[PDB]
Write an enzyme that holds these catalytic residues in place. Sequence first.
Site, PDB file in Angstrom:
ATOM      1  N   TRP A 161       0.878  -1.161   0.000  1.00 40.91           N
ATOM      2  CA  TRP A 161       0.000   0.000   0.000  1.00 40.91           C
ATOM      3  C   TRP A 161       0.920   1.216   0.000  1.00 40.91           C
ATOM      4  CZ3 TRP A 161      -2.188   3.121   4.458  1.00 40.91           C
ATOM      5  CH2 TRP A 161      -3.357   3.814   4.087  1.00 40.91           C
TER       6      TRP A 161
ATOM      7  N   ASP B 289      -1.061  -3.323  10.642  1.00 44.30           N
ATOM      8  CA  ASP B 289      -2.006  -2.392  10.047  1.00 44.30           C
ATOM      9  C   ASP B 289      -3.264  -3.234   9.874  1.00 44.30           C
ATOM     10  OD1 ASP B 289      -3.665  -0.902   8.456  1.00 44.30           O
ATOM     11  OD2 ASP B 289      -2.063  -0.102   7.184  1.00 44.30           O
TER      12      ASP B 289
ATOM     13  N   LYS C 287     -13.836   0.807   7.061  1.00 43.45           N
ATOM     14  CA  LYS C 287     -14.512  -0.183   6.233  1.00 43.45           C
ATOM     15  C   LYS C 287     -15.522  -1.075   6.937  1.00 43.45           C
ATOM     16  CE  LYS C 287     -10.529   1.058   4.131  1.00 43.45           C
ATOM     17  NZ  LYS C 287      -9.160   0.852   4.610  1.00 43.45           N
TER      18      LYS C 287
HETATM   19  C1  LIG Z   1      -8.097   1.626   4.204  1.00 46.03           C
HETATM   20  C2  LIG Z   1      -6.690   1.282   4.785  1.00 46.03           C
HETATM   21  C3  LIG Z   1      -6.166   1.955   5.946  1.00 46.03           C
HETATM   22  C4  LIG Z   1      -6.822   3.051   6.780  1.00 46.03           C
HETATM   23  O1  LIG Z   1      -7.796   3.849   6.170  1.00 46.03           O
HETATM   24  P1  LIG Z   1      -8.429   5.049   6.900  1.00 46.03           P
HETATM   25  O2  LIG Z   1      -9.381   5.547   5.865  1.00 46.03           O
HETATM   26  O3  LIG Z   1      -7.338   6.021   7.175  1.00 46.03           O
HETATM   27  O4  LIG Z   1      -9.109   4.591   8.114  1.00 46.03           O
HETATM   28  C5  LIG Z   1      -4.901   1.553   6.367  1.00 46.03           C
HETATM   29  N1  LIG Z   1      -4.145   0.580   5.758  1.00 46.03           N
HETATM   30  C6  LIG Z   1      -4.643  -0.070   4.645  1.00 46.03           C
HETATM   31  C7  LIG Z   1      -3.727  -1.139   4.039  1.00 46.03           C
HETATM   32  C8  LIG Z   1      -5.903   0.294   4.183  1.00 46.03           C
HETATM   33  O5  LIG Z   1      -6.348  -0.382   3.082  1.00 46.03           O
END
Ligand SMILES: *Cc1c(COP(=O)(O)O)cnc(C)c1O
Lengths: 396, 396
Positions: B130, B211, B246
């Site tokens: 990511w 994470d 999510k």
């Molecule tokens: C969606 C996501 C997050 C955090 O998203 P926020 O919108 O900031 O809550 C963190 N790490 C990954 C790999 C994600 O896909």
Amino acid sequence: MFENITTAPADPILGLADLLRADERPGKIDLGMGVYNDETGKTPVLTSVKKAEQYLLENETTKNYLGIDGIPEFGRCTQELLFGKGSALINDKRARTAQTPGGTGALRVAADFLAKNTSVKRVWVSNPGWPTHKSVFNSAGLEVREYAYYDAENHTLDFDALINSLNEAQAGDVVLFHGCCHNPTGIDPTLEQWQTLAQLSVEKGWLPLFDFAYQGFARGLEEDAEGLRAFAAMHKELIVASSYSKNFGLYNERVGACTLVAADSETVDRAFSQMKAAIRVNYSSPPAHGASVVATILSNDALRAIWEQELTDMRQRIQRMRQLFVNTLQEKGANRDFSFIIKQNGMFSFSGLTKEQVLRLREEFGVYAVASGRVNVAGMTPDNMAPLCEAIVAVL
Amino acid sequence: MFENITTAPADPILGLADLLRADERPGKIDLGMGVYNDETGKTPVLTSVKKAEQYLLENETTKNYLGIDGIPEFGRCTQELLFGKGSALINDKRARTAQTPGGTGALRVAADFLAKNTSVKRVWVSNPGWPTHKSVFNSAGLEVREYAYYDAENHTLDFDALINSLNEAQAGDVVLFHGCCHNPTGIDPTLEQWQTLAQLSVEKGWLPLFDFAYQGFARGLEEDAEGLRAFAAMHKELIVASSYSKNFGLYNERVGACTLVAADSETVDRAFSQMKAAIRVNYSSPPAHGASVVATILSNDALRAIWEQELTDMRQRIQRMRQLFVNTLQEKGANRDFSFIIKQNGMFSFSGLTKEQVLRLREEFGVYAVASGRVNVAGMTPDNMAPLCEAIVAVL
Ligand SMILES: *Cc1c(COP(=O)(O)O)cnc(C)c1O
Ligand SMILES: *Cc1c(COP(=O)(O)O)cnc(C)c1O
């Protein structure tokens, strides 16, 4: 890895909260953090806010991410509130606003933006001032310098010392000004002084950064912004960090904005793209609820009218507590003259109490104020006024 | 001062939003950002969330600042969700949780905390991975290193290459792991692999940083946390950045948490005081609304039951779109075998399309995916499946 981390020093303002909950005795009086209390000593949700939250509950259809800069309407309304309905800055599209998590969040975003995208190395703040300013800018790698501001003997703004103090400021240096309701002196420059400052700023090439967290608590929404508007008429560039925490009573929803102004639209847009980059690696996009409440209120004639009246009632109650405070102090044997407190605007009162007197008020009277001698007048009620003044008279 | 600032490079993921609104033609299909869509292609507010917001509207009596670390109940419930109801980490008070603005905000807080309070100089992330991870840690002054993870030829986790890649990691180095639903491969380690990794981590002295943004989207709330719990049983210290964006559909309210774990309560408390110091100079205190919604739901048996079912329905709809995608692809003349897509969990599909194929899908078909070939399956509906697969078959 964490065996040797040292305990962090307590925050002079935020730390008061920890001592309050730790203190068990009854009758405690919180005059520390700048939060509005009504006649009953509670911090209610404004009626206009409850109505806006009602509207959102029924009309909101998704929680889908906001853009990096937040709700566009919020930005438009914030710009109008700062520069005036038909301002030229708005017409020429010279300003860009990012919704941020509180006024502190806006300062942080401004700090990160400046540190890695400009030659700025120094930020000038007032002394006395708001401690969080130094902490935020230092955290971004910028050095903080202080300029004189208060005449403690005459309880007035030492304009002469302010100007002389700033002569040491070089071009390209950032100079931070409190929009109104200077924290903690409550003493603001007159319109003529603002004009002189705007003129001096242009001439010496300083980058103005306005911290606006009390718009509407001095004289009124439009009047409180006169200083800023004086600067905006002279300057090609400037930064405004504003907060809706106090004037909307939305403290915990973290509603603020960082507004950037440049010579023209292509320049501001270019610079703003880097501001968004700064936000992107911090919290990504801002919290919708609080800002959505503000946008709803400001854009609805009915709700705006109610909100504006609630703001007026808050300002007026503080003014009344300010006069009752002075009277009750002398009425109970006040050692000296505290009439200078009537001329201070905002939620606070820079009382002139020493660090030891404040400590004593806390330990044997259960009255909590900031070590600087700053007391939150908005925290005074007809119920705690008597015991409050009796404790103060005992330490004088 | 802003004359020479350069335009910021567009974000590979967030930037897709800008191109979408800029594109006028109808029929556009958004398979970019990881947002859940229902069968109708909209991102609704969950029913449990609406009910919680209803409760808050009627019972909330103030917007007064939250403590720096946020709502305590939120923290307790987050810890239970991560480590399990009667976990030893909770019993021994070895964990401290700060409510943060989203999972990205938690990562930023973790980054600032590590950079100025520890000897950490390097953070290891997976490749593919990511992009925001590198950007956030680099912004804090930490260098990012990559470890192998995916076997593109076999569409599987290359465990061997992962281990060999990490042997270059030294003690005191931070190693970041995705709790579940690896972004973007959708391929997670089996429980046995997690156990091997937990063992290898302790032995080489790495600092694990998890994470966790998709708890509940792979197999279930408890099952998805098995890997983390495997690590928590072996390690004395670790960091968890989690998100409720999510699994609660609270994207724009910015609801996340940064959980810190130490050998004992006195150590974690000491280290946590520095985490709070990091937050203090950023946004001060977190936004209440979103986190308050989560706490209300998780602490109310009735609401929790409804929420958990809604989560299940989301996971199941994605699984169904995943199988309909594969079938529709071969049904329309799929050049190759896409059965490997069925074994990927989470919202995404690491399709294997090249950068040019993704660009072509966008320019002549109006289908938007990330340049890495990552497509958001949660964005597929029975309505756009046909045109979607026809465009993909045309670029193969
Ligand atoms: C969606 C996501 C997050 C955090 O998203 P926020 O919108 O900031 O809550 C963190 N790490 C990954 C790999 C994600 O896909
Ligand atoms: C209250 C205040 C702010 C901003 O507060 P937030 O709670 O972060 O919105 C900024 N500057 C001063 C001087 C303040 O008093």
